[PDB]
Amino acid sequence: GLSDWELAAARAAIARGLDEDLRYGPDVTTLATVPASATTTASLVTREAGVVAGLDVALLTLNEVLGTNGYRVLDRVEDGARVPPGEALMTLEAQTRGLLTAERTMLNLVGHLSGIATATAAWVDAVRGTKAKIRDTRKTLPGLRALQKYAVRTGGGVNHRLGLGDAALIKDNHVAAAGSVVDALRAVRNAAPDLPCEVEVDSLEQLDAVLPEKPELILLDNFAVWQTQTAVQRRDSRAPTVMLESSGGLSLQTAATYAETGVDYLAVGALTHSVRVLDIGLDM
Amino acid sequence: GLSDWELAAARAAIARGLDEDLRYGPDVTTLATVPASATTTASLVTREAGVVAGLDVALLTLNEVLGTNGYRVLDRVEDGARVPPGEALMTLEAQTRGLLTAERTMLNLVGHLSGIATATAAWVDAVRGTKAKIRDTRKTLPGLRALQKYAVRTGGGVNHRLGLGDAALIKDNHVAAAGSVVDALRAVRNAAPDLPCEVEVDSLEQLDAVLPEKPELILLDNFAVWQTQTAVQRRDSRAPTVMLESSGGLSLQTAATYAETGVDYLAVGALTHSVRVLDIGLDM
């Protein structure tokens, strides 16, 4: 599931987690109570319902602590699976000391990634029967972007920008320096003609101004549903090729309403900032 | 505010955030619209009320992108400040391109940390007029532990374990291997006599068993209020020196109820997993 870029990011994150955990000394209690030869069958089981994501990251943690052949996976669920409360996501047999050392880092990571996938799946259900797609933002946690981006995709979302040079996004700041939105739009087009041009507008006035310029995407910044409807109507009549994305006053309660206006995407920053963990435990 | 360890953690996190953002190329649009000689006064302003934390981390991001003397702080609030909606947390003058590049990383980091401090401050208010202190856990995001820990302290919480070797914590797994809870307890005492001994129990029977052993702390794993009240009564009469910490079925609505039983600490994993961003913007 994880690509090369994601696999590297995953390894880097697990390595960081373990170091934080092992920086003060080994788990003196398991050393004192559990023999090296001990081995168990343990299960990652959810304490709540949700969508699972990050299971490969769990195996990667074990690889690091136990060695690739330090354990045996007796069974597992696939990432993306919708799962009920006492569901065993993965069952494995491994050295007990290794499992106990890996545990917290492993659980912190899959719990976070499952929290994201869970939430995005809710957004996706909310706008179903609409053409809208749930997209993420750059409002990610430092060091965790590839993984968080991976988890929204697992939940059924689509990734937007990966960084600053990914696409050209004209905002208020650029607009000002350029003079106007269309001034900025033109400047960037002339400077990086091979790059996706996305412009952010906060008024129907700026919208009317940029539509003829035909940028790749216009982000409707904090528009009411009625203004979003209007923006879709004007786009459909004046620049059918311009994609529209709602960004701002979105809540899961208002999701379908906005979606029903016909916008193409809903930019949800909450999917990655503001995430609630999916409670999962290691049962031995 | 930031310790040695925290300042290092912070620099590493901001470094990682910037690399994620600059991995695909520079911000072509600010390069095209704003001249290198440009300078502005910009303000970090909250869009909601809360407790601020991580402002030094903002400064650290600028040092990285702009160089220590690449900007001037005209004004700032102190971390820990309770703040109303349109509050300017920090005002600075800096090279415009530098600010636009640093923006997303800087906002992602203080928004998260403020999110944590704000939440912990709420828990701390919830239990006021009680002797209970709010404590954090090892349920942190990989690579962000020092920062998350710092933020709960800023909101008035108290940090607990920093890692695995930090203190001896006897759980179910250890008890079994040892034979019993007291067996495990004795083994660790004998192996690491200079280490704080914390034992986790899930029943009043196990509690009765370990109390005489006088561990430093007992974590009441998922006890009902009535059982917590009983645990406190038993501790007060049998082992007055043993600290009691509620862990598990805690919510901000029930926090006072648990606190009123007389427990010494409330372990709140939600302070660090499950955090809601404090919405902050950079206004120019």
From Swiss-Prot, chains A, B:
Pathway: Cofactor biosynthesis; NAD(+) biosynthesis; nicotinate D-ribonucleotide from quinolinate: step 1/1
Keywords per UniProt: Glycosyltransferase, Pyridine nucleotide biosynthesis, Transferase
Glycosyltransferase listed as a keyword: yes
Superkingdom: Bacteria
GO cellular component: cytoplasm; peptidoglycan-based cell wall; plasma membrane
Catalytic activity annotation: nicotinate beta-D-ribonucleotide + CO2 + diphosphate = quinolinate + 5-phospho-alpha-D-ribose 1-diphosphate + 2 H(+)
Keyword set includes Transferase: yes
Binding site for substrate: 104, 137-139, 161, 171, 200, 221, 247-249, 268-270
TM spans (from-to): none
EC numbers for this chain: 2.4.2.19
InterPro entries named among the record's database cross-references: Aldolase_TIM (IPR013785), NadC (IPR004393), NadC/ModD (IPR027277), Nicotinate_pribotase-like_C (IPR036068), Quinolinate_PRibosylTase_N_sf (IPR037128), Quinolinate_PRibosylTrfase_C (IPR002638), Quinolinate_PRibosylTrfase_N (IPR022412)
SUPFAM superfamilies assigned: Nicotinate/Quinolinate PRTase C-terminal domain-like, Nicotinate/Quinolinate PRTase N-terminal domain-like
GO biological process: NAD biosynthetic process; quinolinate catabolic process
Alphabetized GO MF terms: nicotinate-nucleotide diphosphorylase (carboxylating) activity
Subunit structure: Homodimer. Hexamer formed by 3 homodimers.
Function: Involved in the catabolism of quinolinic acid (QA).
Entry similarity comment: Belongs to the NadC/ModD family.
Listed name of the protein: Nicotinate-nucleotide pyrophosphorylase [carboxylating]
Source organism: Mycobacterium tuberculosis (strain ATCC 25618 / H37Rv)
Encoding gene (name): nadC
